[PDB]
């Protein structure tokens, strides 16, 4: 596994997230479900607890965007970069963005929102790309790998 420059991690254990807007590709509940299930992947094997916000600035702001959308990393249309997220910190740090030029699906016919979001929340919590693994930079009975478990635990520990 790998972490970010200067080993950044959330200094607290109670983290807030807000789903800022929604993809047209799914019903809102499917997006909510994939996000919650993405958070649980990490919440279950750490002391971290996630709460949802509907107003104001949450630590992890979750949004769908296309092309240029207010940061230094514009999206690139269909394919290539499906999503990205930021290391722990204030402001844009911790936030996760999803390219809405991808076809976000509940299943595997398009791009699975849950699977990318899980990988993205890994970035929101201080994990970078592995060398093996959910944090491996490639979208390909699902279980969080030992290499992934080792990563988040060498940072926050177990529950
Ligand atoms: C299911 O977990 C994912 C989630 C997203 C991606 S990605 O969007 O296709 N990835 C960007 C990425 O890692 N964002 O966090 C592309 C990339 C291209 C070149 N260098 C590094 C990465 C892949 C697997
Ligand atoms: Ca943030
Ligand atoms: Ca793209
Ligand atoms: Ca889309
Ligand atoms: Zn972005
Ligand atoms: Zn990534």
Curated annotation (Swiss-Prot):
Protein residues bound to Zn(2+) 2: 119, 123, 129
Cellular compartment(s): Secreted, Extracellular space, Extracellular matrix; Nucleus; Cytoplasm
Binding site for Ca(2+) 3: 76-77, 79, 81, 99, 102
PTM text: Directly cleaved by HTRA2 to produce active form.
Binding site for Ca(2+) 2: 59, 91, 93, 95
Active site: 120
Binding site for Ca(2+) 1: 25, 100, 102
Binding site for Zn(2+) 1: 69, 71, 84, 97
Homology family: Belongs to the peptidase M10A family.
Function: Metalloproteinase with a rather broad substrate specificity that can degrade fibronectin, laminin, gelatins of type I, III, IV, and V; collagens III, IV, X, and IX, and cartilage proteoglycans. Activates different molecules including growth factors, plasminogen or other matrix metalloproteinases such as MMP9. Once released into the extracellular matrix (ECM), the inactive pro-enzyme is activated by the plasmin cascade signaling pathway. Also acts intracellularly.
Entry's free-text remark on domains: The conserved cysteine present in the cysteine-switch motif binds the catalytic zinc ion, thus inhibiting the enzyme. The dissociation of the cysteine from the zinc ion upon the activation-peptide release activates the enzyme.
Associated clinical condition: Coronary heart disease 6: A multifactorial disease characterized by an imbalance between myocardial functional requirements and the capacity of the coronary vessels to supply sufficient blood flow. Decreased capacity of the coronary vessels is often associated with thickening and loss of elasticity of the coronary arteries.
Stated name of the protein: Stromelysin-1
């Amino acid at each position: 596994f790998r972490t970010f420059p200067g080993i950044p991690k959330w200094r607290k254990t109670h983290l807030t997230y807000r789903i800022v807007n929604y993809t047209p590709d799914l019903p809102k509940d499917a997006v909510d479900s994939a996000v919650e299930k993405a958070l649980k992947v990490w919440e279950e094997v750490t002391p971290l607890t996630f709460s949802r916000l509907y107003e104001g600035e949450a630590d992890i702001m979750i949004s769908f965007a296309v092309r240029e959308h207010g940061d230094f990393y514009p999206f690139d249309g269909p394919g290539n970069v499906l999503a990205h997220a930021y290391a722990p910190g204030p402001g844009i740090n911790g936030d996760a963005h999803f390219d809405d030029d991808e076809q976000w699906t509940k299943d595997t016919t398009g791009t699975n929102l849950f699977l990318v979001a899980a990988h993205e929340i890994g970035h929101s919590l201080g994990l970078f790309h592995s060398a093996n693994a959910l944090m491996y930079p490639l979208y390909h009975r699902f279980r969080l790998s030992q290499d992934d478990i080792n990563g988040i635990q060498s940072l926050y520990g177990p529950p």
